[PDB]
């Protein structure tokens, strides 16, 4: 069994931030959930991560271009 989770930061062997990955249930439940390294892949948290990353990455892009 695996759980689909959406990463909030970059993890070395997993993937980049905002990307959905599959992890062991104990891994997410006991490490990634309390440290806010990943959220469960449901629609409310997917929407939250997508829109907040859109705002922050848009601010970073607008700062980086000029």
């Amino acid at each position: 069994r695996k759980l689909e989770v959406i990463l909030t930061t970059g993890i070395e062997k997993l993937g980049k931030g905002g990307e959905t990955v599959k992890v062991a249930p104990g891994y997410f439940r006991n490490h990634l959930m309390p440290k806010l390294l990943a959220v469960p892949n449901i629609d409310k948290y997917a929407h939250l991560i997508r829109e907040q990353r859109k705002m922050r990455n848009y601010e970073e892009k607008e700062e980086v271009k000029v």
């Binding site: 759980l3 249930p25 439940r29 959930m33 309390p34 469960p40 892949n41 449901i42 948290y45 705002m55 922050r56 601010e59 970073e60 700062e63």
Partner: protein
Amino acid sequence: AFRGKEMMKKLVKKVGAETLTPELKGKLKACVPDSKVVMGRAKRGLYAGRHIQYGNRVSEDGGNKSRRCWKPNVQEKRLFSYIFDRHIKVKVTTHALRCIDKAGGIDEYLLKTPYQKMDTEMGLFWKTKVEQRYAELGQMEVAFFNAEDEAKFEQGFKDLNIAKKDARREARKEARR
């Protein structure tokens, strides 16, 4: 046996029977759990409907039968809650753990499970508390800031910290003096 009726009696007595319309009474009967929960420790945990079974242990050659029991796979676990930002220490079955994994956390399990499936007055309390906390967060927003505003705020906190540390040093000097 008739757990819905005895829990309804407590609910009516606590709230007040004058506050309740007939249609609200009909609705509240549909929400109060009435599952067959007998064992005392299940009323204090989150078992998701698992309950101890009693049956026969059957010998191999003779077929002799003696009474045994089947116990649920209960573990005391700390489950992280997003809306309280802390761990909640609950006696759960592993079946309830698997249901919570499917739901996406203890908060989402409490939000999505209907009132009748909570099986327990304490489960009703926790579901009500998490629903109220999520309703409070549902009327809020956060504003974000430009990187130059972020730099100004970083410098503002730095000046506050330096003022606090110099005030502490001067307080130490004056209490020494």
